[PDB]
Structure formats: structure tokens, C-alpha cells
């Protein structure tokens, strides 16, 4: 339907074990296509999907350069962040940033993104209007007036509305075959006894992309939310994902239960049961 290009930066400080490490990875929906690690022997931006490879020298250059600066950028951040929180130079702190641009099933910019987090806590974030910021603590507010003072918000937008989207669109064309193809899950229900009176019903969904899915269980048509046991959606390794739900039923009533599945690869939602 709609797509999104997204970037993830992560910086860790290690007192005594060298300068802080910076790793950058880029996606387009649930697919990764770039990587950069200041901790690699001879760091440079490396491809992670086939389609990106067709880009020329320039692209790889310009990017590697941007990434090397960003390495120095976040190192001043770890340093600064110490004065904002009265922290010592002896501890280790992680810095996390995310930023991207969602496009709509038509091509135009649907919405932009940019958030920051210090040690897992939300720091500051540009609002959906792409012109103002939301700070989480007095420290963040110091950061804000800087950015407001330097019209930093505008820069980000000019990107998010220009370069970011212009590329998400290109990246998508060279990757039609996969990026723009949904692989509906292969579903089925399984039976596992437990007690002469109870039994487990496990509803599976395998080999599907994108990872956004929905598996539900029902007893006589009513939801079993608080009784269902859902596992986090885990990656298959081939690019698809997996997921499963479970509910424990009394021996006999198993037919009074129905699994329900939704995924964009399915035209109409599904409804499975145990087929003994």
C-alpha cells in the first residue's frame, strides 16, 4: 500500500575501550539496504540488498562522507550530554536516533519523522508539522532553543520533503520485484494435548512479508485476548517473518474455537480451525 524509508543511528561510549562506536542502518519498509560501522576495518557504507548495488560511485561516496561526519557529530553529543545531566566521563552512555519519510500509495509525502533518545529515554522530537519540537526534560529544552535559533527544523524538512522522498521513490522502482510485493502467510492450526481435560491449540502463520500481521483467537465468536498467548513477531531469515498464537481448551470443545488472520497479502481475512 504505502511505503517508508527509514534510518537508525546508535552510538555507545566505552571508557578506556576507544572512541564511541557509531552504527548506521537504512531501511525501506521492513527491508534493510545499507549499513555503516565505525568499528569495521576500513569503514564505508555497504549494501545489504541486491537492488541498491546498481548505484554508482558518487552515491556510495557522498554517503560514506555523511556517515563519517555523523560519527564525529554523535561523539560531541555523548560529551555534551554529560554536562546536560551532570554525568561523569567514566560511565558508558548510548545515543539513539531515528528519522525518515513515509510516502503514500500514490507517490507524495505522507509524513515525516525524527526522534532522539538518551539511554532509552525519549529526549526531543520534531513534530509532524515539521517545524517545532517536543522536549522531554529541561536538558532537551537547551537543545531545542539551539535548533530553533538555527532554524534547524527547516533544514530537516527541506530534506524530508525533497531528497528523502525523491529517493524512497527511486529505491522502490529498482526494487519492484520484492519491495512492492506482499507474501501472504501460510497458515494452519495444530493440536497438543496436556491433561486428560485440557489441550493446546496453536495457530501459525509462516513465511510472510511485510511483518505487520494480526492473529486472533475466538471462543464462540467472542475474543480471547486475555487468555491468548502471543509470541513476538520473529524474522525467518529469508526475509519473511513468523508468528503464532495459542489458547488452552478443554478436551471436547476444541471445535468451539476459531483463529482469525489478517495480512495485506490476503484479499479477505481468513478463518481457520483444527482439522483432525
Amino acid at each position: 500500500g504505502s511505503h517508508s524509508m527509514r534510518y537508525f543511528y546508535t552510538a555507545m561510549s566505552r571508557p578506556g575501550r576507544g572512541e564511541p562506536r557509531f552504527i548506521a542502518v537504512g531501511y525501506v519498509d521492513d527491508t534493510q539496504f545499507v549499513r555503516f560501522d565505525s568499528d569495521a576495518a576500513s569503514p564505508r557504507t555497504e549494501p545489504r540488498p541486491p537492488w541498491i548495488e546498481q548505484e554508482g560511485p558518487e552515491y556510495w561516496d557522498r554517503n560514506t562522507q555523511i556517515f563519517k561526519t555523523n560519527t564525529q557529530t554523535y561523539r560531541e553529543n555523548l560529551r555534551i550530554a554529560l554536562r546536560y545531566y551532570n554525568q561523569s566521563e567514566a560511565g558508558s552512555h548510548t545515543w539513539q536516533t531515528m528519522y525518515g519519510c513515509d510516502v503514500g500509495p500514490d507517490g507524495r509525502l505522507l509524513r515525516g519523522h525524527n526522534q532522539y533518545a538518551y539511554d532509552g529515554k525519549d529526549y526531543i522530537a520534531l513534530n509532524e508539522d515539521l517545524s517545532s519540537w517536543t522536549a522531554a526534560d529541561t536538558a532537551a529544552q537547551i537543545t531545542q532553543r539551539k535548533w530553533e535559533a538555527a532554524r534547524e527544523a527547516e533544514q530537516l524538512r527541506a530534506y524530508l520533503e525533497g531528497l528523502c522522498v525523491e529517493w524512497l521513490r527511486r529505491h522502490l522502482e529498482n526494487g519492484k520485484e520484492t519491495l512492492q510485493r506482499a507474501d501472504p502467510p501460510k497458515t494452519h492450526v495444530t493440536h497438543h494435548p496436556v491433561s486428560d481435560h485440557e489441550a493446546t491449540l496453536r495457530c501459525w502463520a509462516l513465511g510472510f512479508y511485510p511483518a505487520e500481521i494480526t492473529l486472533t483467537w475466538q471462543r464462540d465468536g467472542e475474543d480471547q485476548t486475555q487468555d491468548t498467548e502471543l509470541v513476538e513477531t520473529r524474522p525467518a531469515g529469508d526475509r519473511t517473518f513468523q508468528k503464532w498464537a495459542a489458547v488452552v481448551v478443554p478436551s471436547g470443545e476444541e471445535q468451539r474455537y476459531t483463529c482469525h488472520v489478517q495480512h495485506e497479502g490476503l484479499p479477505k481475512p481468513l478463518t481457520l480451525r483444527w482439522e483432525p
Binding site: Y7, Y9, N70, T73, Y84, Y99
Partner: peptide, 8 residues
């Protein structure tokens, strides 16, 4: 392609 983020 990728943005040049400003310091904290």
C-alpha cells in the same frame, strides 16, 4: 540519501 544531523 542520508541527512547530516546537527549536534545536540
Amino acid at each position: 540519501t542520508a541527512f547530516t544531523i546537527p549536534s545536540i
